[PDB]
């Protein structure tokens, strides 16, 4: 109960699928692959731990 929230819900898992196809929609070069979702987890790690500074 020090800093962090969440206990890894599938509701977070389905959301990370949601924003990936969203970023696959704006930057559509028909490349839904590992690198496209690598852009996605790139955002969830920098949104999280904004309090650790």
């Amino acid at each position: 109960s020090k800093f962090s929230f969440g206990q890894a819900t599938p509701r977070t898992l389905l959301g990370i699928i949601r924003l990936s196809q969203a970023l696959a929609k704006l930057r559509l070069a028909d490349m839904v692959d590992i690198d496209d979702v690598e852009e996605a987890l790139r955002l969830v790690r920098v949104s999280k731990e904004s309090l650790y500074q």
Binding site: T9, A22, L26
Partner: protein, 169 residues
């Protein structure tokens, strides 16, 4: 600065149909991002300036269209046809941007109002006039203000947001 957060929003300004489900499985779409923190750079005109150029994204605040008048209701009118269904924001800003501020304001009606749109498809008027229910397809962008002074980072979080069940799940 803040290129991380200006990138987190442009993906949500396009949205798109989640999945054409066909069968009766109405899946969740249109995720919602909330902000918090107390800068002195007038955080209001940061977010709301995006809203006044983004498509169909209606501005709101704490006063006025509160969580009871966030949906539609029946009111007084002139000498012409009274008891019309005057609306708030969510019955007219369907499938757009609901850019809210002042989250500690009028919370007795607002805390119902945020769950009822995060819950899919129950924007309704459950009054003594009618029991008809309309759609719900709009993203939410929230900015909660902290408690007095600064949010103490050495203290526990959720000392200033009052909804645990709306947030962590």
């Amino acid at each position: 600065g803040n290129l991380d957060v200006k990138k987190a929003l442009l993906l949500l300004l396009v949205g798109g149909v989640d999945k054409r489900v066909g069968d009766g499985m109405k899946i969740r779409g249109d995720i919602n991002v909330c902000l918090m923190g107390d800068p002195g750079v007038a955080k209001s005109q940061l977010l709301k300036a995006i809203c006044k150029i983004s498509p169909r994204g209606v501005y709101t605040t704490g006063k006025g269209s509160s969580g009871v008048g966030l949906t539609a209701a029946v009111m007084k009118d002139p000498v012409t046809d009274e008891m019309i269904l005057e609306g708030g924001a969510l019955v007219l800003a369907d499938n757009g941007i609901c850019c809210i501020d002042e989250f500690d304001k009028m919370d007795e009606s607002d805390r119902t109002a945020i769950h009822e749109v995060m819950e899919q498809q129950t924007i309704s008027i459950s009054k003594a006039g009618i029991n008809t229910t309309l759609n719900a397809r709009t993203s939410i962008l929230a900015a909660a203000n902290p408690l007095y002074g600064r949010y103490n980072p050495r203290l526990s979080p959720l000392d200033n947001i009052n909804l645990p069940a709306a947030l962590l799940s």
